[PDB]
Design a protein around this ligand. Structure first.
Ligand code: A1BRN
Ligand code: ZN
Length: 139
């Protein structure tokens, strides 16, 4: 569980989205596991606009923040689940670090702000859905 609150937008994992999220839908992409819905209250998360490859992510399964090195956003294959069939997820960044079911939604941050959210994991690895290319989140 977890979301990004920037201006009048809420950013969540698409597979974790609520009824409210779908009834107030702005944009969604299954191939990125992202969904953006509208909000009445104003959010103050700063989204990073950079090509950083080091940052810090929140791991709810350990109740701890962890520093990580992470790869450039790319098309990576992701095994089947009760939410999606086997497929390549786009805009995904990998890091060596702990994650287990229940960790999706944890924020990855760099010195410039929010980079993305936990979206995949397993085998001593963690995957993040990048949000830095979504320039419209700020306007
Ligand atoms: N983006 C997807 O299609 C996800 C959907 C949920 C499930 N997805 C996973 O990665 C599986 C899983 C979840 C987690 C996460 F929550 F950190 F992701 C950690 C580990 C694992 C593991 F190791 F058991 F396979 C794909
Ligand atoms: Zn940065």
């Amino acid at each position: 569980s977890g979301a990004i609150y920037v201006g009048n937008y809420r950013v969540v994992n698409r597979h974790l989205a609520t009824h409210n999220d779908w009834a107030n839908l702005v944009w969604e992409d299954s191939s990125r596991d992202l969904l953006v819905s509208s909000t009445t209250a104003q959010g103050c998360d700063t989204i990073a606009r950079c090509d950083c490859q080091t940052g810090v992510y929140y791991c709810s399964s350990r109740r701890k923040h962890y520093p990580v090195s992470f790869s450039k956003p790319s098309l990576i294959f992701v095994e089947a689940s009760e939410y999606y069939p086997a497929r390549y997820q786009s805009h995904l960044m990998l890091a060596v670090g702990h994650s287990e079911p229940g960790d999706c939604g944890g924020i990855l941050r760099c010195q410039h702000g929010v980079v993305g959210i936990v979206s995949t994991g397993g085998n001593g690895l963690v995957g993040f859905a990048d949000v830095r290319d979504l320039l419209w989140l700020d306007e």
